[PDB]
């Protein structure tokens, strides 16, 4: 949003891991297509 919500290092690492897993799933779906 407008106000930047501060997160921890572990929460940011978990968000980056979830984004990488979503990108890997999108790449696997694109490869299957």
């Amino acid at each position: 949003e407008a106000k930047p919500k501060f997160l921890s290092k572990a929460e940011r690492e978990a968000e980056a891991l979830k984004r990488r897993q979503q990108e890997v799933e999108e790449r696997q779906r694109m490869l299957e297509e």
């Binding site: 106000k3 501060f6 290092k9 940011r12 980056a16």
Partner: protein
């Protein structure tokens, strides 16, 4: 021929001057060396040679009749005719621009390359008319063989069979026929490069002479291709020069250039198609087993480790939308040896586009043996156009070693370039506001005798400054009258409230002292207002803020008061916040001013009182981000253009192709005097010198250049009777002798009273030249017509490199020559290197954008926020960092702030990572406590660092280096090794004085380093404690050390009292 042999063996053969053949070459060499500039100087240089004496003694041998000798006894007409013929030969060969009207000659790059390589005029003309950027390697040999050095070399009919045999063995094909001398010279060069055995002795001598000419010809061709910008032609010329120097083909082995390698092992390595990079990864046994030679495997491994191959790393940062800053870190990955590499290794680094045809940035790097095995960082400016390439290529090749080149692809695919800059606020063509436009008569009485009408930018800003109270961002160049707008805003704040509290923050201490001295005569003398200046003492600063209405301060002085704004009610009850020169908020004292502005913007939105913020700075391109970060409105943003100054500035750039800084400073003395004589003959001039000791040398060189010509003592517009009371007050006899001729000097080592006397002598018009140091650029209360800034660099001894001058000091030196009534315009001649000419030309007319560098110095701001109970959690720290200028600069330039996107999630993750790094740096230094990785608590060390304005690293060093049994000799070394002593100036010729003073100190230093600033601070503290004698440059550093040594001793005493130590506290 028996008579002439009888003439030389019996003293009967007079020596006849044959200087008419190389007279245009000598004229071009004298024009490139700076000895001759016009036709009169060329005639005077020709008259001092032996050719004029031979023409005067024997005119019949020189082709002069008796009537020409009778009509010209001094041989001036024949010398003028020879100078005109040499000028016509130089202009026809495009070597030097020679005008027939005035007779002045300007040396071009082709003439300088011909003089530096001893090339002829016809060869230079053939190289200028023959070399194309789309030329291949086959045409390059034909262009090099068609020079004027081989004009007398003929193709003999007896050597036609040898040329036909060598035509089938040369690796470079020749397009010309066998009867042409150019193809014969190309075949001879191919035979000398490939070490082909010849048969004819005269053909071998012609090939040796052709190679001895072609070495300098290829060097001049490589210089001309580097000056022209053709990247592929320069690469081919460098390959041809390396093949001519190493006497080997480009496809040969890299060990052939080393004379210690056997020929049979080199032939066995060349027989196997293996790259040279694969041999570096192998060991001494694997390289011996791969080439089937285990005895020579260790020698091959030593030759691979001794071959020049360095690792290059690229760091790109887009500063503007058209140019970026590229930092190249070069790490030597080879064993440096004096028998292989020597004292230094020269390399050429060329950064070009994806097409590899236009060299965008060409430079040289001389890695010395003393600076070997260390990564050197070279900063360059790379331009970028609207068709942005996916990647640029930075090729660093070896200038002496063949087949030693490292290529770095700098990718621009994921480069987050900033957006387009908004147009600046143009000055409307309105009527100038008179002195009667103001309401208060006391405010108009302080500016009636100064000027009857204000500036047009001041007339446009008076409607938003005097008739309003909002935050106004005034981006005006140095000399446009920002002080008049600041005085109008102060008068509006005084008319709105008579008991107001105005605070004017300026980064430079000398500029703040000048502003305080101006306000003492303008606001305190004519309006009777309490105008005070803040000091470095926190006890008197509160009384000066409570009793003063106009407080001039520094960001380093106001950061101690803004850190306790919740407790101090006088800082919360402010009426006006003026911030002068905010454009220097991205350099020295840069994040401190931004942190003070963010603290003022946070306290203005939390104390129920909107303070009038007036941010006066230079013309910035990204002024919208600075207006949004300071709360300025869109109508109050008076960001003018750099070309909208009242005094028109004519900016000239003198690029000198000199790698050494001392050689460039020695060579740029006479062009500086030539530019001073050509631009402003009867006007005062200010010469910006690189160093303090170089200012007296530049003044002596200017005095010698003035006394060499007929205009002796032309810089002294006054008489000696008016300067005799002025020269009697100076201490240096050399400075008084230079000021007697009209050339004053000013440096950091000079006295302040002597500097004030020199400024009063230069402002009155007695002297015409003022050689001021680079540190006295901002601290100069004078305005001249010409500003010659010579060699804008500094030889830093802490890194031992010639670091370039910052843009803020260059802008201050450009704006220092702002004469509104004394001169109609202002000349600014920046004489620097050729690589820094494009950046200085781009940062002069275009507005310089502001870039927040608060990420490198966020630890002290985080400690000050946590100690004042402001940033108590992670969200509070994120909200405090979001209100600063770094959050506004990250949204405009993500790649400059090391971000990967302008999205909210990526910026939030970057802010969380920065907050976590700051919390880890605070917890590792025992300055803060992290409760559940979310809450921040100030510790004792962090509160002691924020109270005495100390860094976290210095507080951690004082906490980990002071024990319960410490002494004074250990406490002095602990205070000298603090973070505040790392900013000590380290220049050339300073290690010998430190080594001489280290033997007289009362306390010895365990393994002292001549390049470390902590050892210099310890030596200065030992000299100040023992009251020993020192130089002026040492005393100028000792005073800056002792200015913070009291706060360092107070922090050490607080750390000793907090740890429960009585005897180390008493020793401190």
């Amino acid at each position: 021929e028996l008579q002439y042999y009888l003439s030389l063996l019996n003293q009967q053969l007079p020596i006849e001057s044959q200087m008419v053949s190389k007279l245009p070459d000598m004229l071009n060499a004298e024009i490139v060396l700076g000895n001759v500039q016009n036709a009169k100087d060329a005639v005077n240089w020709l008259g001092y040679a032996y050719l004029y004496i031979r023409m005067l003694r024997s005119p019949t041998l020189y082709g002069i009749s008796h009537d020409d000798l009778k009509g010209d006894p001094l041989l001036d007409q024949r010398r003028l005719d020879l100078v005109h013929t040499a000028a016509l030969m130089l202009d026809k060969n495009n070597l030097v621009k020679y005008d027939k009207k005035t007779g002045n000659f300007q040396v071009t790059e082709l003439g300088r390359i011909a003089s530096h390589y001893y090339i002829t005029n016809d060869t230079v003309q053939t190289y200028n008319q023959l070399l194309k950027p789309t030329l291949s390697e086959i045409e390059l040999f034909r262009v090099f063989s068609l020079s004027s050095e081989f004009k007398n070399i003929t193709v003999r009919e007896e050597e036609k069979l040898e040329l036909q045999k060598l035509l089938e063995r040369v690796p470079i094909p020749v397009k010309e026929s066998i009867e042409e001398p150019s193809a014969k010279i190309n075949v001879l060069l191919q035979a000398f490069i490939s070490q082909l055995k010849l048969e004819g002795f005269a053909l071998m001598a012609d090939m040796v002479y052709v190679t001895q000419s072609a070495g300098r010809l290829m060097r001049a061709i490589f210089e001309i291709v580097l000056n022209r910008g053709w990247a592929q032609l320069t690469d081919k010329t460098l390959n041809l020069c390396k093949m001519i120097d190493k006497r080997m083909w480009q496809s040969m082995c890299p060990l052939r250039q080393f004379r210690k390698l056997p020929e049979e092992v080199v032939k066995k390595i060349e027989k196997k198609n293996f790259p040279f990079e694969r041999l570096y990864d192998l060991n001494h046994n694997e390289i011996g087993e791969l080439i089937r030679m285990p005895k020579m495997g260790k020698t091959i491994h030593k030759y691979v480790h001794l071959f020049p191959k360095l690792e290059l790393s690229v760091h790109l940062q887009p500063i503007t939308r058209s140019t970026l800053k590229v930092e190249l870190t070069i790490t030597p990955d080879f064993q440096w040896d004096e028998k292989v590499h020597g004292s230094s290794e020269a390399f050429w680094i060329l950064v070009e586009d994806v097409d590899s045809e236009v060299i965008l940035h060409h430079e040289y790097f001389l890695l010395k043996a003393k600076y070997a095995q260390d990564e050197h960082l070279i900063t360059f400016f790379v331009p970028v156009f609207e068709p942005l390439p996916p990647q640029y290529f930075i090729r660093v090749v070896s200038d002496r070693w063949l087949s030693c080149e490292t290529q770095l692809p700098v990718s621009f695919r994921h480069l987050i370039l900033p957006e387009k800059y908004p147009p600046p606020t143009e000055l409307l063509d309105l009527q100038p506001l008179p002195v009667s436009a103001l309401r208060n008569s006391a405010f108009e009485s302080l500016y009636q005798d100064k000027f009857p009408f204000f500036n047009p930018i001041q007339t446009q800003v008076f409607n938003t400054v005097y008739n309003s109270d909002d935050n106004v961002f005034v981006g005006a160049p140095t000399g446009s009258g920002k002080t008049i707008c600041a005085e109008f805003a102060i008068l509006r704040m005084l008319l709105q409230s008579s008991e107001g509290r105005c605070v004017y923050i300026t980064p430079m201490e000398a500029l703040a002292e000048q502003v305080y001295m101006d306000w003492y005569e303008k606001f305190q003398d004519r309006l009777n207002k309490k105008v005070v200046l803040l000091t470095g003492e926190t006890s008197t600063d509160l009384k000066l803020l409570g009793k003063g209405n106009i407080i001039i301060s520094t960001p380093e002085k106001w950061d101690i008061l803004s850190r306790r704004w919740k407790q101090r009610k006088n800082v919360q009850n402010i009426n006006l916040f003026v911030v002068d020169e905010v454009h220097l908020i991205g350099g020295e004292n840069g994040p401190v001013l931004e942190v003070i502005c963010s603290r003022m913007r946070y306290i203005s939105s939390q104390i129920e009182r909107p303070i009038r913020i007036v941010a006066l700075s230079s013309s910035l391109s990204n002024a919208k981000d600075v207006a949004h970060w300071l709360g300025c409105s869109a109508t109050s943003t008076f960001n003018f253009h750099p070309n909208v100054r009242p005094v028109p500035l004519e900016l000239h750039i003198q690029g000198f192709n000199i790698s050494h800084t001392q050689t460039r400073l020695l060579s740029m003395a006479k062009p500086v005097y030539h530019a001073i004589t050509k631009h402003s003959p009867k006007k005062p001039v200010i010469v910006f010198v690189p160093s303090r000791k170089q200012t007296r040398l530049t003044a002596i060189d200017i005095l010698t250049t003035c006394a060499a010509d007929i205009q002796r003592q032309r810089f002294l517009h006054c008489t000696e009777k008016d300067l005799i009371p002025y020269l009697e007050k100076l201490s240096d006899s050399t400075l008084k002798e230079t000021l007697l001729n009209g050339v004053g000097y000013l440096h950091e080592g000079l006295s302040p009273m002597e500097r004030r006397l020199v400024e009063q002598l230069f402002s009155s018009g007695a002297i015409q030249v003022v050689v001021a140091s680079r540190s006295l650029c901002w601290g100069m209360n004078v305005a001249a017509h010409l500003v010659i800034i010579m060699d804008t660099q500094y030889y830093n001894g802490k890194i031992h490199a010639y670091v370039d001058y910052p843009i803020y000091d260059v802008l201050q030196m450009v704006g220092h020559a702002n004469r509104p009534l004394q001169d109609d315009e202002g000349r600014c001649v920046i004489m620097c290197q050729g690589s820094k000419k494009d950046f200085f030309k781009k940062f002069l007319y275009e507005p310089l954008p502001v870039e927040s560098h608060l990420d490198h110095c966020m630890h002290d701001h985080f400690n000050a926020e946590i100690v004042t109970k402001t940033i108590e959690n992670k969200q509070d720290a994120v909200d405090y960092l979001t209100w600063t200028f770094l959050y506004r600069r990250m949204t405009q330039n993500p790649n400059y702030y090391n971000l990967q996107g302008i999205s909210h999630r990526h910026l939030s993750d970057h802010l969380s990572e920065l907050v976590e790094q700051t919390l880890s740096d605070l917890e590792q230094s025992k300055c803060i406590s992290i409760e559940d990785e979310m809450d921040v608590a100030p510790l004792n060390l962090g509160m002691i660092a924020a109270y005495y304005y100390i860094n976290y690293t210095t507080i951690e060093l004082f906490s980990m280096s002071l024990n319960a049994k410490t002494k004074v000799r250990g406490l002095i070394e602990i205070i000298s090794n603090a973070a505040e002593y790392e900013n000590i100036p380290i220049r050339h010729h300073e290690d010998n004085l430190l080594r001489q003073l280290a033997q007289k100190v009362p306390h010895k230093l365990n393994n002292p380093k001549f390049n470390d600033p902590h050892v210099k601070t310890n030596l200065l503290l030992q000299a100040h404690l023992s009251r020993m004698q020192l130089s002026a440059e040492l005393q100028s550093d000792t005073e800056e050390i002792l200015s913070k040594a009291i706060r360092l001793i107070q922090a050490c005493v607080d750390v000793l009292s907090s740890n429960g130590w009585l005897s180390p506290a008493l020793a401190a």
